[PDB]
Each structure stands twice: as structure tokens, then as C-alpha cells.
Amino acid sequence: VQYSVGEGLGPTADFPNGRYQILAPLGSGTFGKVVSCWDRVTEQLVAVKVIRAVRKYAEAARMEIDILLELGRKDPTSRFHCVRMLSYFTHVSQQGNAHVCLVFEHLGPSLFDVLMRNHFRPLPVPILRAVARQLLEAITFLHEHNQIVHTDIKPENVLIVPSSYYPNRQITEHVQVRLIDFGSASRLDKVSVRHAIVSTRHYRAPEIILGTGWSFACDIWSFGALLVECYTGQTLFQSHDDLEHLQLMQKLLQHENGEVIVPPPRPSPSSTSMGSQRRREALKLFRDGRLNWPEGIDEQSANSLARQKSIRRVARMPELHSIFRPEHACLLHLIRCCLTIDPLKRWRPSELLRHPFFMSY
């Protein structure tokens, strides 16, 4: 439903027109819309995330509510940089539509907002380091103190604490950030390996595409991607095709020791599991163990313009080592610890927090 500035949300006795009054738009996503609100009870600014009137996003929102209850219980000050959820309710519409609403602390713009406002110019390395350290602290918190995996590490889900922000709208190395959006997170304390399609495309780890089971390590891959983005201001993997995405991965890391896209083990024909179906769809992308690129881009067409554009796009993809200037060699190594095709090779976030890129500063 379309919402305008001035309308209310969450009606109570003292405020029959809504406890939370809309002041400004804050953000949007497939889940719904996040709106800046004035809490008529506490007379403070809050951020109300309203979920779309769909069942799947409602389940996701309830999972986010549960996880954020646990996270606010185990860290109320938010020493580990996770967004504080103040409240949650259900707003009914004039048409009978029920929307889940989560009330969070009011934060500033996203890291994506920062990158856009500066015309996608590369983020300086010291600010990059501050943000990466705090984000890595949050990921360490989740993974190792809660056995929770986020799966949606993206620049849109890292927000600036407004106290660090300034009216000149230029962040410094003292910026404070918070990780948000736990509507896709999963607890791995009982089942640590999953096979469902998760992660935003551009930050999706290869094991998720290939079907060899993902776990905590996938977040690290996303983290790595994000870092490269912050170094260049540009999205690393710009593709929505699985074959092209895996080829871009292979190209970015071709001259990295031991990084080759390998197909999953072929399951039995009498296997109906979600993982086996993903593995079959993934094997459909390979020919004799090699990634069917570029001939697989347009199989039927012998002379295709889409295949030629895919060839050009993969050629434009740089080798990882060539992206970074020499003086930033350390950062390169840090990202090598994250952008590995085998999830078993990626470092733990606690180990990454002890990398020279951080503890030599």
C-alpha cells in the first residue's frame, strides 16, 4: 500500500490514528518499505520497517523479529554493531491488509547511499578499514557467539550511525556502522549446512549456485565482494546469469593459486532432495567438468549477439591482483582470504580481525 508523509501506523488507545507518525521515507526493498517515524509514546525518532502483504515476507519478518530479540538480549548496548529492534506490531490497512512492522533505532544512510552520493568514487582505504573492522566484528559476533549466518551481506545493509555522520555529509575514519536486515538469517546450531538459494545475486557465494551446501563461509565471500566494491565504488559481479556469474568468478581469480570453478558431485538418479535438484541444475552448466562458457550462453545459436556481449563483459572483468595499487598490497591479501571458491578455504571472521590489514594499523 502507498503511504504518504503525515499518516500514522500502529493504532493504540492514547493514539487512535497511529503510535508512529510518518515523517520521511528511509528505504525500500523486496520485503517492503522502511520509513522514518515519530514515536508519539516516547517522543523520539524511530525507523519502522513495514513488510509487504505477502506470506513469505511475513515469515521472513517474524524470523527477523525472533533473531533480533535474541540479539538485543545478548547485546543491548550493541557493542557488536547489530541494529537494535525496539518494538514490533501488525498494522491493518483500510482494505483489511495486515502488514508486519518492526520498529528499530533510527540510523543514517547506508553504505550504498554513501557510495552513490559520492558518484561511486572509490572509498578511501582508512574509512574502508574502519567499516570493514566493525562489520567483521558484527559477523564474528553472529557466527561465533550466536551460530547465526546473515546471508545478505550487502552495502545496503550497512548503515551509518548518525552521530558519526555530519551535515557536510562526508564520512571520516571515525564513522560508526550497524549491520541490519536479519529477515534472511538462519541459525546453524542444529543444522549447519543448507542448500536453499540465498544471498543477493551480486554477493552470492559459488557454493550456493553449484549446490555443494553452504554455511557460515558464504558470508565471508559476501564480505570479500563488499570490500572489493568499497575499493572501486563499483559492483564486482554485474550479471544475473549463473553461467556468466561463475565465469566472472573464474576470471577474477584465474591467476590466484588453486581457484577453479568445479562442478558438484553428481547425485544418484533416485535423489529428490532440494540439494540434488540444485546440483542437477548446476551440472547443466558444465561440459566434461569444465564450465560451459562461452558456448553455453547461447547453446542453440551458432552466431549469437548475447554470447558476444558476454565475452566482452567477461573480458572487462579484471584479475583480482590488478585491481589494487601496490601500496594496498595488504588489503589484497585480506581479500584473498575471503574470495576463495572453496568455502573450506575462507578464513573465519575472528581470524580476519587479526589480519595485518587491521592489527598493523
Give the annotated binding-site residues: 56, 152, 181, 330
CA atoms of 247 and 235, how far apart (whole Å): 16
> Taking the chain, what is the end-to-end CA distance rounded to the nearest angstrom?
48
Which of 114, 128, 139, 159 is in the footprint of ligand ADN by CB under 6 A? 159
Which of 22, 60, 71, 107 is in the footprint of ligand ADN by CB under 6 A? 107
Cell of 302: 551458432
Nearer to ligand ADN, 111 or 248 (CB): 111
Give the binding range for ligand ADN (CB under 6 A) out of 3-11, 53-61, 99-107, 343-351. 99-107
Considering only residues 35-74, where is the footprint of ligand ADN by CB under 6 A? 47, 49
User: Shortest distance, CB of residue 154 to ligand ADN, whole angstroms?
Assistant: 9
What is the biggest distance separating any 2 CA atoms in the chain, rounded to whole angstroms?
70
Cell of 208: 550456493
Give the binding range for ligand ADN (CB under 6 A) out of 102-110, 236-244, 270-278, 291-299. 102-110
Q: Are 159 and 180 in contact (CB under 8 A)?
A: yes
Nearer to ligand ADN, 26 or 332 (CB): 26
Active site residue 219: no
Residue 343 touches ligand ADN, criterion: CB under 6 A: no
Task: Spot the catalytic one: 152, 219, 242, 288.
Answer: 152
CA atoms of 74 and 68, how far apart (whole Å): 10
**Whose CA is closest to 129, among 230, 222, 225, 203?**
230
User: Shortest distance, CB of residue 312 to ligand ADN, whole angstroms?
Assistant: 32
Nearer to ligand ADN, 184 or 310 (CB): 184
Considering only residues 171-210, where is the footprint of ligand ADN by CB under 6 A? 180-181
Identify residue 297 by its one-letter amino acid code.
Answer: I
Nearer to ligand ADN, 105 or 207 (CB): 105
Print the binding letters for residues 273-312 with ligand ADN: x by CB under 6 A, - otherwise: ----------------------------------------
- Residue count at the site for ligand ADN (CB under 6 A)? 16
**Whose CA is closest to 220, among 304, 132, 301, 146?**
132
CA atoms of 206 and 46, how far apart (whole Å): 37
CA atoms of 361 and 358, how far apart (whole Å): 6
Cell of 182: 536479519
User: Shortest distance, CB of residue 29 to ligand ADN, whole angstroms?
Assistant: 4
Nearer to ligand ADN, 27 or 349 (CB): 27
Residue 106 touches ligand ADN, criterion: CB under 6 A: yes
CA atoms of 293 and 310, how far apart (whole Å): 9
Number of Cα atoms under 13 Å in the Cβ half of residue 287? 8
CA atoms of 324 and 232, how far apart (whole Å): 9
Q: If you ran DSSP here, which 8-state letter would residue 318 be given? A: P
Q: What are the residue numbers of the active site?
A: 152
Residues found near ligand ADN in the complex (CB under 6 A): 26-27, 29, 34, 47, 49, 83, 104-107, 110, 156, 159, 180-181
